[PDB]
């Protein structure tokens, strides 16, 4: 069911990243790949029930 | 003058409270690098102190 | 006034130079000061040792581009590499014992026997502190695990040992990184060489004979600023080749550290 | 140093009189203006008269 | 052949914190460091005006309110490299050629 | 449409030119003589004033 | 590189505020940035403070921090000096452990002694000064053995079973001094260390020679001793021995095993920083050859 969630969301795991890349997450590190063309600049949003 | 216009937002321990408090989030772990625009509003120590 | 000792000396030299005679068949490309010297442990008595340039290791390296290997194949066809492939290629996944880093050149004399100075510690530079010679890593061999430039990156020379095919074709990895703790540098090496760490188990699954060894070896070479990092261009014997330059590179030759 | 503190106590008495005197001036302004408040009917009354 | 042209030097007009009009807000005064052991927690007996009143509400009996302030240092530092060649040629004079 | 209303908060970053007007002789500042230090390298000599 | 580091303060010093820092002269001070004028907010281990209350993560983040010896309290600045390789400078004791001449020393994260002297010795609006311990090498690594045995022990156990060994494991003893150790338990960094640990245990189990692994049993009937009686109990689970093999194979079967003996012990190994020479009679200062 979790694979169906990642598929329906469209956000597939990048092989759970490198294990050292997970080790750097506790210090904080970028996860998003940079978008290619970005004429509109930085994007942001948030969500609340 | 409503006691809580957004019961699932203003309440302590609501879904947005645990979702956005830095304390309730770090108890589950998170990447510090990502910005959380709503999180600045729900914090206790940022506000109560 | 009297006893003006300051006038007597022209300049001090912190660098620990050494003069090594070299065969004329290896002087090519080596004539540029920025190149590693690496003694080889030949099994023959005459001679038991044989200096080789780091570029000579790339004719057999796997990770280097094959188009560069087509160029290097036309370069070293002389008394040197014809014996080097006869010896170091014969070695069964053993290089850190066969090889021994010996710093980089300061100057290269010509002649039929090309003696050359080579510092084993400190900055390498032209005499009278004039021109500042720079180290030259081969283009494809250079890499960084972190694409971000650091404030100050030490350089290391890992020697990967693949165990896939019956004939091992070890890779060579110069790399700069701001990391300075070997206990963490092996940890970042753990997840990146997953095919190589799998390969060390992959020999035991097939051939109990002949012991598998290192997935790599790490040793200090020296520090360099991110602004000192460069990727320029080099020419010798008309065969042009771009290279990853390093400017003010102090030499600090640490001992090899074997590990899996 | 004690003789310097003599001059310090003298200046303390000087400001104790000066600031009380200027406060007496502000009190005379505040009191006379307070009398003007009681003395002055609202304009719409005076216009009706 | 081919033409060449020389010293198109980058002229740099000088500036000063003192010549600037922004210093009018400043009360800058160069002064030797005392190695003060932090004496920068200055006190201030700031005199406070008051007013007499005929109202029965009390007026303050205490002239001049206390004020504590601090001297928040913000040091700056500028590296500038000099090549060892430029130094070794600077003091020495080989007197071999022009 | 489900039962979820949304407060989609979103911060924005704007470039801003500004101006400021301190009074004359506002903050006071004092400075000392520069203290040069001679950092040493065999190939060059940086100087941190 | 730089030979020295400087710092700037916010909240102003008093008599005690500068006296506690003059007490810390010639003592270890980690920095993470090595800029010529670091801010005090970046100074110390306190920047890595963690509400999750970890420890091993503080150690791994400590692994990359540069060490810098303290010197000269000019006032309103730390004036750190950057140690040079291969020489010596005096170093004050910090960690509550007795020192002896010639022992190796290493950096370890602090932990409360038990009674807890709780001497922060410096504080501001919230920021503090947490100086990592300088401890003798066997003590520096045995705690890593405790955290590693704590990691392997956690698997497949009831909570009373999980904490049963902990009453002995977290109460380490050394030179009369005793220490209780709060632990991350599971902080991923212990897990990634466990992965290379068991991977080393596998090859060490597999690279062993047929006679080398049998050597204890070959000695078992050969001799009788209480250490061997303690040796005997571990190996058995509930007399014959064989011998073959050509001599040349052992030079290979043993050689690669030495690399695993490093790779297995590397994770409990820590880089040395100090080597004491002239111990002070008062048990405070101690000059040490070699630095970071």
UniProtKB/Swiss-Prot annotation, chain B:
It is found in: Virion; Host nucleus. It comes from the Viruses. Self-assembles to form an icosahedral capsid with a T=16 symmetry, about 200 nm in diameter, and consisting of 150 hexons and 12 pentons (total of 162 capsomers). Hexons form the edges and faces of the capsid and are each composed of six MCP molecules. In contrast, one penton is found at each of the 12 vertices. Eleven of the pentons are MCP pentamers, while the last vertex is occupied by the portal complex. Belongs to the herpesviridae major capsid protein family. Homomultimer. Makes the hexons and eleven out of twelve pentons. Interacts with triplex proteins 1/TRX1 and 2/TRX2; adjacent capsomers are linked together in groups of three by triplexes, heterotrimeric complexes composed of one molecule of TRX1 and two molecules of TRX2. Interacts with scaffold protein; this interaction allows efficient MCP transport to the host nucleus. Interacts with capsid vertex component 2/CVC2. Interacts with the small capsomere-interacting protein/SCP. This is Major capsid protein. The lineage of its organism: Viruses, Duplodnaviria, Heunggongvirae, Peploviricota, Herviviricetes. The gene is MCP. The chain holds residues 1225 to 1273 of 1370 of the full protein.
Curated annotation (Swiss-Prot), chain C:
GO terms for cellular component: host cell nucleus; viral capsid. Keywords: Capsid protein, Host nucleus, Virion. It comes from the Viruses. One of its GO terms (molecular function) is DNA binding. GO terms for biological process: viral capsid assembly. Its main location: virion. It is found in: Virion; Host nucleus. Pfam families: Herpes_VP19C (PF03327). The keyword Lipoprotein does not apply. InterPro entries: Herpes_1 (IPR004999). The keyword Plastid does not apply. Interacts with TRX2, MCP and capsid vertex component 2/CVC2. Structural component of the T=16 icosahedral capsid. The capsid is composed of pentamers and hexamers of major capsid protein/MCP, which are linked together by heterotrimers called triplexes. These triplexes are formed by a single molecule of triplex protein 1/TRX1 and two copies of triplex protein 2/TRX2. Additionally, TRX1 is required for efficient transport of TRX2 to the nucleus, which is the site of capsid assembly. Belongs to the herpesviridae TRX1 protein family. This is Triplex capsid protein 1. It comes from Human cytomegalovirus (strain AD169).
From Swiss-Prot, chain F:
It comes from the Viruses. It is found in: Virion; Host nucleus. Belongs to the herpesviridae major capsid protein family. Self-assembles to form an icosahedral capsid with a T=16 symmetry, about 200 nm in diameter, and consisting of 150 hexons and 12 pentons (total of 162 capsomers). Hexons form the edges and faces of the capsid and are each composed of six MCP molecules. In contrast, one penton is found at each of the 12 vertices. Eleven of the pentons are MCP pentamers, while the last vertex is occupied by the portal complex. Homomultimer. Makes the hexons and eleven out of twelve pentons. Interacts with triplex proteins 1/TRX1 and 2/TRX2; adjacent capsomers are linked together in groups of three by triplexes, heterotrimeric complexes composed of one molecule of TRX1 and two molecules of TRX2. Interacts with scaffold protein; this interaction allows efficient MCP transport to the host nucleus. Interacts with capsid vertex component 2/CVC2. Interacts with the small capsomere-interacting protein/SCP. This is Major capsid protein.
Curated annotation (Swiss-Prot), chain G:
InterPro entries: Herpes_capsid_2. Belongs to the herpesviridae TRX2 protein family. This is Triplex capsid protein 2. The keyword Cell membrane does not apply. It comes from the Viruses. Keywords: Capsid protein, Host nucleus, Virion. Structural component of the T=16 icosahedral capsid. The capsid is composed of pentamers and hexamers of major capsid protein/MCP, which are linked together by heterotrimers called triplexes. These triplexes are formed by a single molecule of triplex protein 1/TRX1 and two copies of triplex protein 2/TRX2. Additionally, TRX1 is required for efficient transport of TRX2 to the nucleus, which is the site of capsid assembly. Interacts with TRX1 and major capisd protein/MCP. It comes from Human cytomegalovirus (strain AD169).
């Amino acid at each position: 069911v979790d694979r169906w969630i990642r598929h329906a969301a469209g956000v597939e795991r990048p092989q759970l990243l490198d294990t050292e890349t997970i080790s750097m997450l506790t210090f904080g590190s970028m996860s998003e790949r940079n978008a290619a063309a970005t004429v509109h600049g930085q994007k942001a949003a948030c969500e609340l029930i | 003058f409503a006691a809580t216009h957004n019961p699932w937002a203003s309440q302590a321990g609501c879904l947005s409270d645990v979702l956005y408090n830095t304390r309730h989030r770090e108890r589950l772990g998170y990447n510090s690098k990502f910005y959380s625009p709503c999180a600045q509003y729900f914090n206790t120590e940022e506000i109560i102190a | 006034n009297t006893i003006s000792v300051r006038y007597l000396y022209h300049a001090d030299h912190q660098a620990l130079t050494a003069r090594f005679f070299v065969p004329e068949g290896l002087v090519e490309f080596e004539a540029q000061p920025g190149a590693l010297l690496i003694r080889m442990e030949t099994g023959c008595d005459s001679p038991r040792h044989l200096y080789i340039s780091l570029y000579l290791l790339g004719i057999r390296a796997s990770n280097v581009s094959a188009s560069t290997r087509c160029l290097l194949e036309s370069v070293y066809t002389a008394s040197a590499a014809r014996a080097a492939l006869q010896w170091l290629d014969l070695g069964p996944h053993l290089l850190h014992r066969r090889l021994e880093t010996l710093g980089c050149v300061k100057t290269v004399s010509l002649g039929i026997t090309s003696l050359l100075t080579c510092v084993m510690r400190g900055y390498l530079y032209n005499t009278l502190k004039t021109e500042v010679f720079a180290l030259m890593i081969p283009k494809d061999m250079y890499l960084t695990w972190e694409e971000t430039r650091g404030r100050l990156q030490y350089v290391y020379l890992i020697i990967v040992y693949d165990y896939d095919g019956p004939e091992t074709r070890p890779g060579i990895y110069v790399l700069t990184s701001s990391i300075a703790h070997w206990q963490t540098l092996v940890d970042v090496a753990r997840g990146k060489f997953a095919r190589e760490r799998c390969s060390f188990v992959n020999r035991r699954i097939t051939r109990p004979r002949q012991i598998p060894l290192c997935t790599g070896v790490i040793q200090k070479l020296g520090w360099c600023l991110a602004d000192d990092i460069h990727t320029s261009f080099l020419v010798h014997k008309e065969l042009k080749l771009s290279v990853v330059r390093l400017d003010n590179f102090s030499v600090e030759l640490g001992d090899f550290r074997e590990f899996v | 140093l004690d003789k310097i503190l003599n001059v310090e106590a003298m200046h303390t008495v000087l400001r104790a009189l000066k600031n009380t005197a200027d406060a007496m001036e502000r009190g005379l302004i505040h009191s006379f203006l307070q009398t003007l408040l009681r003395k002055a009917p609202p304009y719409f009354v005076v216009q009706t008269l | 052949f081919e033409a060449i042209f020389g010293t198109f030097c980058n002229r740099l007009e000088w500036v000063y914190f003192l010549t600037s009009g922004l210093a009018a807000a400043a009360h800058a005064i160069k002064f030797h460091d005392l190695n003060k052991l932090t004496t920068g927690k200055m006190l201030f007996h700031v005199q406070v005006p008051r007013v007499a009143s005929g109202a029965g509400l009390p007026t303050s009996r205490q002239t001049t309110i206390m004020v504590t302030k601090y001297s928040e240092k913000s040091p700056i530092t500028i590296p500038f490299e000099l090549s060892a060649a430029c130094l070794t040629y600077l003091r020495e004079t080989f007197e071999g050629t022009i | 449409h489900p039962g979820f209303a949304l407060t989609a908060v979103r911060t924005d970053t704007f470039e801003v030119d500004m101006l400021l007007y301190s009074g004359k002789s506002c903050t006071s500042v004092i400075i000392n003589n520069p203290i040069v230090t001679k950092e040493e390298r065999d190939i060059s000599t940086t100087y941190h004033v | 590189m730089e030979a020295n580091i400087f710092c700037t303060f916010d909240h102003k010093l008093s008599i005690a505020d500068v006296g506690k820092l003059t007490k810390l002269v010639a003592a270890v001070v980690p920095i993470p940035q090595r800029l010529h004028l670091i801010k005090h907010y970046q100074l110390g281990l306190h920047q890595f403070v963690d509400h999750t209350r970890g420890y091993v993560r503080l150690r791994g983040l400590l692994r990359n921090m540069t060490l810098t010896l303290m010197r000269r309290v000019e006032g309103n600045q730390i004036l750190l000096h950057v140690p040079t390789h291969g020489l010596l400078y005096t170093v004050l004791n910090t960690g509550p452990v007795t020192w002896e001449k010639g022992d190796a020393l290493c950096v370890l994260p602090p932990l409360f002694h038990g009674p807890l002297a709780r001497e922060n010795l410096l504080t501001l609006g919230q920021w503090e000064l947490v100086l990592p311990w300088i401890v003798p090498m066997p003590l520096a690594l045995e705690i890593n053995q405790r955290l590693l045995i704590m990691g392997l022990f956690s698997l497949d156990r009831s909570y009373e079973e999980v904490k049963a060994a902990v009453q002995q494991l977290q109460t380490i003893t050394f030179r009369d001094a005793t220490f209780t150790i709060p632990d991350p338990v599971i902080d991923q960094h212990l897990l990634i260390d466990m992965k290379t640990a068991c991977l080393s245990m596998s090859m060490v189990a597999n690279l062993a020679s047929e006679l080398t692994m049998t050597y204890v049993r070959k000695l078992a009937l050969e001799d009788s001793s209480m250490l061997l009686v303690k040796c005997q109990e571990l190996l058995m689970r509930l007399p014959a021995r064989p011998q073959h093999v050509s001599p040349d194979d052992e030079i290979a079967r043993l050689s690669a095993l030495f690399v695993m003996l490093r790779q297995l012990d590397d994770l409990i190994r820590e880089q040395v920083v100090f080597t004491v020479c002239d111990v002070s009679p008062d048990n405070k200062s101690a000059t040490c050859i070699f630095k970071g």
